[PDB]
Design a protein around this nucleic acid. Structure first.
Ligand code: MG
Ligand code: MG
Ligand code: MG
Ligand code: MG
Ligand code: MG
Ligand code: MG
Ligand code: MG
Ligand code: MG
Ligand code: MG
Ligand code: MG
Ligand code: MG
Ligand code: MG
Ligand code: MG
Ligand code: MG
Ligand code: MG
Ligand code: MG
Ligand code: MG
Ligand code: MG
Ligand code: MG
Ligand code: MG
Ligand code: MG
Ligand code: MG
Ligand code: MG
Ligand code: MG
Ligand code: MG
Ligand code: MG
Ligand code: MG
Ligand code: MG
Ligand code: MG
Ligand code: MG
Ligand code: MG
Ligand code: MG
Ligand code: MG
Ligand code: MG
Ligand code: MG
Ligand code: MG
Ligand code: MG
Ligand code: MG
Ligand code: MG
Ligand code: MG
Ligand code: MG
Ligand code: MG
Ligand code: MG
Ligand code: MG
Ligand code: MG
Ligand code: MG
Ligand code: MG
Ligand code: MG
Ligand code: MG
Ligand code: MG
Ligand code: MG
Ligand code: MG
Ligand code: MG
Ligand code: MG
Ligand code: MG
Ligand code: MG
Ligand code: MG
Ligand code: MG
Ligand code: MG
Ligand code: MG
Ligand code: MG
Ligand code: MG
Ligand code: MG
Ligand code: MG
Ligand code: MG
Ligand code: MG
Ligand code: MG
Ligand code: MG
Ligand code: MG
Lengths: 271, 46, 94
RNA sequence: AGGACCGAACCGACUAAUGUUGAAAAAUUAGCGGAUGACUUGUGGCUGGGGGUGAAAGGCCAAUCAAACCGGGAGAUAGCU
RNA sequence: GCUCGCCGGAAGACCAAGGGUUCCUGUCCAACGUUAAUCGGGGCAGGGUGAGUCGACCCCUAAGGCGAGGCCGAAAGGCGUAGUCGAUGGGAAACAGGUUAAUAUUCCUGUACUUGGUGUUACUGCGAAGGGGGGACGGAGAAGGCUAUGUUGGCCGGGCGACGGUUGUCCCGGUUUAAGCGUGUAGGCUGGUUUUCCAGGCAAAUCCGGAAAAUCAAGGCUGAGGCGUGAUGACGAGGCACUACGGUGCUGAAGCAACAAAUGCCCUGCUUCCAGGAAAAGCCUCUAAGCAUCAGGUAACAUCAAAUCGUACCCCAAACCGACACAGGUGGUCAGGUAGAGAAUACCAAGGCGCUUGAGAGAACUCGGGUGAAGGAACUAGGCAAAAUGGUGCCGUAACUUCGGGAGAAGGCACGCUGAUAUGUAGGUGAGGUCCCUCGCGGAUGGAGCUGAAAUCAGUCGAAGAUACCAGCUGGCUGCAACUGUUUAUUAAAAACACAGCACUGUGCAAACACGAAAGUGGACGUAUACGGUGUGACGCCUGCCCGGUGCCGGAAGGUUAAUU
């Protein structure tokens, strides 16, 4: 649930927590963990390639299963867990054969729930099956774009995709953006919405919170000198130019999709 | 006042020492130049 | 097994000094100048063969050379290895 | 509980007088701000010059910065002194 | 040498880094030392650094570096796989005393430990580049148990006072002892043991994981400290022999108890929070290829082994970074007493220093301080600077408010010492005795002794009792920025930047975008509740009209329009 924190200090006043009690209070499943060091938004050349990334808390990498290939073995959900690497919550499941995996926790899922991957599997939340097997009109998440690859669409805290149509070897998805997109019908998909839907109701409430999430501050181009950004300079507050990136490209409105290889799959762009 | 030079031997060696110089082409060139000049101490190496 | 030839080369001199004398008298320990490359075992071997005397143990150390000035010109003395060699109880050395 | 409060260490640098061929090429003494954090600090690492880095002052990049230093083109050119 | 003064969370002690002989001894005083110098971190000579257990090396890895092939690139070269390097992190082992002019966990004395071989007898499934476990981990908070350490008493040794008193409830000193081995406690974690099966752990697995079934409620792991031993020893106040006045040799009493007590240890624990908290080896275990009655494994016992390099000295400084013997800078560890909340402050201990020019004088003026009649901001751009306020407890406290605040609002009262309450209370601690007992570091009862606030009443001294040091000035109206933060190293700390929040806009994943002739990398092991860019800047009430201009978005009928032909 969302919880507005009492204003016992400024910087706590405007804080709203999203507190789920059903998460595992404990150390995560250590076999599925692995190291994940921070970039600082800097590439192999050592240059900053993406501004405003830096610091934040140490995090392990939970190895989430997005491919979801244990066909026919029924799994049972052991627990829901906090993943620092994503807006969703993950769920530690236990297959009948003794293997454990992390998956994206879907909306209704909780400890004890049984889930299943495969063509044969029951059309119920958390179950995973090819989109030719999934009924049209259903909400799905963790959608593969290429068969066998692993789920790429609808992974974020409260997302889901609608299967609007199945026309032969393809199905048309209504993506969360509003883009309608053709996808091969043999591509896999998990039933239902992804879990942590009140994630968006959280409000950080202070500068420090942002920092804790590894986000360094962002300086406004207009606050700079002309040598630094296109918006810089001016005595007092001036801004007599069309908005643009730090590299001079228009920012308010100018479209930047150039991919002519996948234009065929996009049925309708978002609006 | 913390002045600019704050010595550290390992750091010095890694930065400027013989092996570092050797490692790259420009470093090698520098060494060669030094040799030509007649430098007694070819590198920072003690 | 150290070579005879090697052994002969190892041991450079006896070291005369107050401390050395004291060591000799009290602790039955002789203070030698040895080759800088000479390991402890080798030194011991040399002692046993060349002085005919049982060795309890050898402690070594490296003495660093002093920097001196002969007139205007600066110059460093050589480093050299000192060895305290402790002889077994009752071993009297000439 | 807290980018909560008072306050030493620690980090800073608002006022003052002193110094200004200094004790010091930015310090002093007296007060002053922060002091569980967007904190501070050791060791090592990475980013290189129209390049880096910048909670943005054209700041900082070895007492050097509206384009570092070293060497070279080079005895640049100087209707000027 | 005797006084005096200063530091004492340091101006003391021990290290790292850095330096590199500055250490110690003798000797010399030209230069160096802001003066003299017999002295010196100066000159010259000699001496000095001892390790299986400390550190490096070594084994393991992090960020990152290099990188066979490889991919990419006019050349140079870039990126990167296998790998291999890389500590600031993980990995076996030593303590006490004694000694040098100068080293010591390194020498000596005592008492220990480790992991390797080799050989043994005893046994008999061993075996990895692989599987599993483990190592292995955050912040804050709270205690409880402890010790370091200190205080008092007892004990032991010495003392009987340069001036009134001082054979006592008097004075001074000491009262120390390790690792190791054994015990396995306060306490923490977990249900164990056996059997059967199984699409999992790249193959196999007797291991792990998962299913069942049986049976027993104690099983195991962890763990400070204490106690015992170690120790008939060592050390020991000071006494006693020699004396090159440096010291050397002999000798040696007591060596207990209580209370207080860490920020250290149990604790890598527990509780809790969200921001969700390295890796790999050593270590344990499982098997595969294999070998097969051999090796290898564990078992004690014997023996051999542990090389190499560092070890002086300075290390908040006269030895390092600052040109200087420079008011500067410099990470870690140690942390006594009285007062105190305290690592603040004051005075002291241990220990270390008086800052390498002195001597006079006692003008103006300058610096740093003290006090000041009457007035009290009249000063001045401005109360700048000074002055003042300043503690604990209790009473009391407005507007306004986002209901948290405002607030330590404001303002007041009490405060010492003595006695009594109470030859020391409330509390804390807790010995004998007595009882129980699955027997121990056990449980009950018991209260000796020890420690010990706070209050009330009564008296009492002073001008003054938070007496020194230490230690808020307060209130009223108002601009700006919500707030904590950041910034021009060295004339600007702000109203500037940032900020949570808001909006627009791009981006469907080989994402947009960015760094790269490219390969590739970041974005992100993220996927539209996400990421980028732009503006605005908490919260509240809001955010009007204009698309002609310039941009952007969409359109494509016509006009115009490149290479090409
Ligand atoms: Mg951003
Ligand atoms: Mg923003
Ligand atoms: Mg901004
Ligand atoms: Mg500006
Ligand atoms: Mg421009
Ligand atoms: Mg203007
Ligand atoms: Mg205008
Ligand atoms: Mg040695
Ligand atoms: Mg605070
Ligand atoms: Mg404060
Ligand atoms: Mg600053
Ligand atoms: Mg000051
Ligand atoms: Mg340039
Ligand atoms: Mg400007
Ligand atoms: Mg500079
Ligand atoms: Mg230029
Ligand atoms: Mg020319
Ligand atoms: Mg010229
Ligand atoms: Mg004093
Ligand atoms: Mg010298
Ligand atoms: Mg000396
Ligand atoms: Mg001398
Ligand atoms: Mg002189
Ligand atoms: Mg003279
Ligand atoms: Mg000298
Ligand atoms: Mg020895
Ligand atoms: Mg060791
Ligand atoms: Mg690497
Ligand atoms: Mg490479
Ligand atoms: Mg190659
Ligand atoms: Mg290695
Ligand atoms: Mg290390
Ligand atoms: Mg180590
Ligand atoms: Mg010494
Ligand atoms: Mg393993
Ligand atoms: Mg913690
Ligand atoms: Mg004690
Ligand atoms: Mg003790
Ligand atoms: Mg008297
Ligand atoms: Mg008298
Ligand atoms: Mg006494
Ligand atoms: Mg013991
Ligand atoms: Mg030493
Ligand atoms: Mg000191
Ligand atoms: Mg001086
Ligand atoms: Mg100094
Ligand atoms: Mg104290
Ligand atoms: Mg003090
Ligand atoms: Mg002086
Ligand atoms: Mg005067
Ligand atoms: Mg005054
Ligand atoms: Mg007056
Ligand atoms: Mg008077
Ligand atoms: Mg008056
Ligand atoms: Mg006037
Ligand atoms: Mg006036
Ligand atoms: Mg003032
Ligand atoms: Mg004052
Ligand atoms: Mg006004
Ligand atoms: Mg502000
Ligand atoms: Mg800063
Ligand atoms: Mg400034
Ligand atoms: Mg200033
Ligand atoms: Mg990519
Ligand atoms: Mg603004
Ligand atoms: Mg408007
Ligand atoms: Mg328009
Ligand atoms: Mg129009
Ligand atoms: Mg157009």
């Amino acid at each position: 649930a969302v919880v507005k924190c009492k204003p016992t200090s400024p910087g706590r006043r405007h804080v709203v927590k999203v507190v789920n009690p059903e998460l595992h209070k404990g150390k995560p499943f250590a076999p599925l963990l692995e190291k994940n060091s921070k970039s600082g938004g800097r590439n192999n050349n050592g240059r900053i390639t993406t501004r405003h990334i830096g610091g934040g808390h140490k995090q392990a990498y939970r190895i989430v299963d997005f491919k979801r290939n244990k066909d026919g073995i029924p799994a049972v959900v052991e627990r829901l867990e906090y993943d620092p690497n994503r807006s969703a919550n993950i769920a530690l499941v236990l297959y009948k054969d003794g293997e454990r995996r992390y998956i994206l926790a879907p909306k209704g899922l909780k400890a004890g729930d049984q889930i299943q991957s495969g063509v044969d599997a029951a059309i119920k939340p958390g179950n995973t099956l090819p989109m030719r097997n999934i009924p049209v009109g259903s909400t799905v998440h963790n959608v593969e774009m290429k068969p066998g690859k692993g789920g790429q669409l609808a992974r974020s805290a409260g997302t889901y995709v609608q299967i609007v149509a199945r026309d032969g070897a393809y199905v048309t998805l209504r993506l969360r953006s509003g883009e309608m997109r053709k996808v091969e019908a043999d591509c896999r998909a998990t039933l239902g919405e992804v879990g942590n839907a009140e994630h968006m109701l959280r409000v950080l409430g202070k500068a420090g919170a942002a920092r804790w999430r590894g986000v360094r501050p962002t300086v406004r181009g207009t606050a700079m000198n002309p040598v630094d950004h296109p918006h810089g300079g001016g005595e007092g507050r001036n801004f007599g130019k069309h908005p643009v990136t730090p590299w001079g490209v228009q920012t308010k409105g100018k479209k930047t999709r150039s991919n002519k290889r996948t234009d065929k799959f996009i049925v309708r762009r978002r609006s | 006042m913390k002045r600019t030079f704050q010595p550290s031997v390992l750091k010095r060696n890694r930065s400027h020492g013989f092996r570092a110089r050797m490692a790259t082409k420009n470093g090698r060139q520098v060494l060669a130049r030094r040799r030509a000049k007649g430098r007694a101490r070819l590198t920072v190496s003690k | 097994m150290i070579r005879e030839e090697r052994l002969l080369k190892v041991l450079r001199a006896p070291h005369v000094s107050e401390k050395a004398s004291t060591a000799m008298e009290k602790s039955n320990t002789i203070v030698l100048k040895v080759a800088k490359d000479a390991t402890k075992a080798e030194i011991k071997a040399a002692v046993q063969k060349l002085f005919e005397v049982e060795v309890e143990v050898v402690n070594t150390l490296v003495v660093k050379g002093k920097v001196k000035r002969h007139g205007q010109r600066i110059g460093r003395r050589s480093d050299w290895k000192k060895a305290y060699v402790t002889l077994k109880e009752g071993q009297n050395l000439d």
